[PDB]
Amino acid sequence: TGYAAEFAGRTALVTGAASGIGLATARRLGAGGARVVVADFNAEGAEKAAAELRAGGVEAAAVELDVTRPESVEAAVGFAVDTFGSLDLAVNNAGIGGPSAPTGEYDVAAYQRVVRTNLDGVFYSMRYELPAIEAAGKGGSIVNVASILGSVGFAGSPAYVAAKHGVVGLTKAAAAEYAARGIRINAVGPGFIDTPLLKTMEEAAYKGLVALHPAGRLGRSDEVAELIVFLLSDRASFVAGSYHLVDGAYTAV
Amino acid sequence: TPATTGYAAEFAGRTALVTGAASGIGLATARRLGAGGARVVVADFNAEGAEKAAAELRAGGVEAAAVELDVTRPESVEAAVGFAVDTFGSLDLAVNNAGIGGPSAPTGEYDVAAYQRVVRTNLDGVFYSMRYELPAIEAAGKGGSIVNVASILGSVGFAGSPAYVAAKHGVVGLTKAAAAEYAARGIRINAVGPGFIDTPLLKTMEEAAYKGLVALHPAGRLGRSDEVAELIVFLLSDRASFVAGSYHLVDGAYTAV
Amino acid sequence: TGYAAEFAGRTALVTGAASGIGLATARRLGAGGARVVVADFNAEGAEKAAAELRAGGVEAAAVELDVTRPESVEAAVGFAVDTFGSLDLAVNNAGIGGPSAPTGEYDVAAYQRVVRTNLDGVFYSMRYELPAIEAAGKGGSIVNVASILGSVGFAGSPAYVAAKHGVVGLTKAAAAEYAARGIRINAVGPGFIDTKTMEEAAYKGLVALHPAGRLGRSDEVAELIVFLLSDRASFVAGSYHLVDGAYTAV
Amino acid sequence: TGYAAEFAGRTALVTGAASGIGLATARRLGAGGARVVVADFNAEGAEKAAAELRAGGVEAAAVELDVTRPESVEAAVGFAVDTFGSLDLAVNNAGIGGPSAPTGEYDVAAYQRVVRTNLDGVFYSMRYELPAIEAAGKGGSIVNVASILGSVGFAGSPAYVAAKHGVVGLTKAAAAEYAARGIRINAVGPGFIDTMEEAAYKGLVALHPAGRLGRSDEVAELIVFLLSDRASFVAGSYHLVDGAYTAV
């Protein structure tokens, strides 16, 4: 019974935890009584997030992480086990971004930058998360942040679309591999979410994005945080290998 | 505030109608809403099974009432909905869980009347449920949420069960179109895709047959009704405020491979 | 080997063959040398189609069909086997329809008509086609005509979307059963097809849903259908093939 | 309207064309009358394939290609354009491979190897084919070779699954981008193909309702259909050629 303490005694690693969905998810894990590891490329921004967590009485600690560098990942996971005694839950959330351009004109470097963070980064994240969770070995749960663009395409963002599809596949294979050893792995596909930078777009564009969501609005970070934290929770014990939309019915048409 | 409100009062005030709620996924789902403080309408084709569920909910201190329902009959569906509104004063959440069933045989040999019985209960029934649910929800109008219980067999096929498979794909269909109509009217509409669920009756079957089913699920076991209900009730909740028009698996990673 | 004699000696039943996609599939089956049964609710339209094929040197014969009635589907299959000796191939194309309304106010009898023709019709089609193809018994191939609306929804059309999703489902389950017996069963998902004089901007509205920037043609769907029917697609089964100008890719 | 001349006066680039599906695709494009640029990391293999097609009355030319290197991909595209004047069609088939391990134990270098070839390789290919096909003004067609594992998972092959997923991805976004300008971009999803082990082979087969494995010719036929004008309203879509493998 209950939400307030359902993650008591548990350690949750959240990548890209300094901003947006990552931060909203860090806070949701805290509201559930989890012990939160705030991990981000932005060292001081992770500290700020984790300090704010502690100031609301949540147990949390910051760690500097770059998902593109396997050893930075391994260290972050080591920090989590070091700091809170185990690794139980993970939210692979770090991600960019990428410029908009047709495939034929797309910058090669931009492509690699996108794929390296969005796809490879998630692979590296799981690569070290899984042993630490398995060795524990009280089972566990991982959620990979994909996107609607992990299941449909988007004109002008081929790298991003590629990567995000890749996260979906990464999720299925891994879940097929681990479900029986009591580690659930799932992915979420959020639609376009309200953010400070998206709220700088001009009226024409923002409206365009909005009309693509039959819901009639963009999503909020919190709203993605709820889906993620559910799939992480014991209530979703038979949810494995699956990809869960939170897109205001963007992909239903 | 979701964390201020908590678990036991999450659904306080809200009226929830659940079809097929005398057993299996429906009963578990009825129980999970009640535990969250919902007012519960137990609807079933087994009228006695309904009353039993409602009564035992009431002893557990849940507000609940039973109603006889046959989803194949639009008139029965309408009356059941009217029963919920008449009994608790609104309709806010609904779970179209009623279904069967059907014989196993290849398409070339599949009994025609059996095909009819399966599609009308499984597909038509869900469309009727929604047909009368939506206006009841819309009129009030505080928005609301509807979950349709399809199946893994709504996204993949299964040899020997083409009527069942087709109806369940149909349910995914209903959910998408309906959700695109109503998402901007505050009514969110979703489906769940349970894998094979440890229903009581499929332990009577072969040692082998069971195991064959289990080997189809990477998680290495079959599901429990309570586990589906957990997903159903999250979709119904305000926490899933941006979830609409989508199909959500609760399987063994069945469909992952 | 050749294209004009690709379906030489094989018999093919096409439902709803008097008009649109069914008709174009019939013509494309004919040009490949197939024997063709033109089955359709509109008996006169079927005969007119059968006649045109015969003018082209194509063995073809008309038969009156209501996919809604199981006994009628059975007879249609019987007519195939009696006329040309065998049943090898089938395209389940007969379908409507459905007026528009939000799900909460949708016309119940209209939901009934739509499901019965589009979904039940396809099931009844396969129910009688398969034993005939099987008993032949050198195997065969069936394509069911679904839609983009077999994989995505469309506001205002719950019944149609439901029925077309059913068709995809019926396709996967049947194909699982019969794959090993040498009978391949697939589905196609056309986008909107030029079938005209709508509200000018309503058509443009429909066109804007297709990144290809135009609607599809009947013949275009038929090419995919006939490919899937052919021995070229010998390892294609249980799959749903889009012909939609990228409608569902976004 | 002429099987043997379906692609007459059209230039087709095929990656991984020295073996298996790419080789069979090349032969099928040739039998259809197309000019065929055989591209491979195996220079000698590519050359033995072009030579064989040439002996068959097919205009063909081989080029060395490493799809992980964007510069090597550009050079192949330019080589096709120079040799045959323009480029109209492309099959992006070069792929491996990859060791078998669970995700938590997977080799970091190998994951990269697999992703670099199978995903990045397809993007680099497209990145250079598109402006070339655009140049010819005539609007062509591109098919990418994904897999059943482009849409479903498979224990032990995380890198591969991810990459094949990214292919389907690239296909959708690129096709959305280019359909209006008259270039259709699609993907194929082959099941397991006979191209070894004990009765693990028997295990594979049992995963396909069809009751056998696929043949590289069977894949080729679907690919070439998609490239053809007969598939003129087919774009942005993923086409399975599996044994009903993904259907259950």
Ligand SMILES: NC(=O)C1=CN([C@@H]2O[C@H](COP(=O)(O)OP(=O)(O)OC[C@H]3O[C@@H](n4cnc5c(N)ncnc54)[C@H](O)[C@@H]3O)[C@@H](O)[C@H]2O)C=CC1
């Ligand atoms: N905002 C949206 O509309 C949607 C976003 N997503 C995904 O949700 C995830 C986060 O999204 P947002 O919160 O909105 O963006 P955000 O900008 O607000 O958050 C990104 C955070 O990840 C961190 N980060 C960036 N690169 C990193 C690296 N190489 N290593 C470690 N940390 C790194 C950044 O420091 C940043 O704090 C991303 O994967 C994004 O692709 C997916 C679908 C919808």
Ligand SMILES: NC(=O)C1=CN([C@@H]2O[C@H](COP(=O)(O)OP(=O)(O)OC[C@H]3O[C@@H](n4cnc5c(N)ncnc54)[C@H](O)[C@@H]3O)[C@@H](O)[C@H]2O)C=CC1
């Ligand atoms: N039990 C399983 O293995 C799985 C079942 N499902 C779906 O879960 C849903 C519930 O099934 P279960 O709980 O597991 O089995 P169940 O039979 O125990 O519960 C279904 C209930 O629906 C009622 N019902 C049947 N026909 C009705 C009608 N015409 N009108 C009104 N009520 C009717 C039944 O009396 C029964 O109480 C169904 O939609 C089913 O297709 C899908 C995947 C797993």
Ligand SMILES: NC(=O)C1=CN([C@@H]2O[C@H](COP(=O)(O)OP(=O)(O)OC[C@H]3O[C@@H](n4cnc5c(N)ncnc54)[C@H](O)[C@@H]3O)[C@@H](O)[C@H]2O)C=CC1
């Ligand atoms: N019109 C379009 O743009 C699209 C249509 N489709 C599907 O393609 C199929 C045929 O489409 P169209 O060529 O446009 O239709 P159509 O209107 O041009 O011709 C349909 C034919 O089927 C026959 N028919 C109708 N009901 C029947 C029944 N109960 N029994 C036997 N025959 C019957 C009609 O007499 C007619 O000859 C349909 O299943 C439809 O859902 C799918 C996607 C796009």
Ligand SMILES: NC(=O)C1=CN([C@@H]2O[C@H](COP(=O)(O)OP(=O)(O)OC[C@H]3O[C@@H](n4cnc5c(N)ncnc54)[C@H](O)[C@@H]3O)[C@@H](O)[C@H]2O)C=CC1
């Ligand atoms: N054989 C199978 O079971 C399936 C294979 N596929 C895919 O179809 C494609 C063809 O595979 P197969 O014919 O079966 O294998 P294959 O070994 O027979 O052909 C691979 C060819 O690509 C070439 N190649 C490898 N790395 C390269 C690089 N970095 N740059 C340029 N060329 C390179 C190889 O030299 C070889 O000639 C691959 O993408 C594969 O992933 C997909 C589904 C089923």
Ligand SMILES: [Mg+2]
């Ligand atoms: Mg499967």
Ligand SMILES: [Mg+2]
């Ligand atoms: Mg869409």
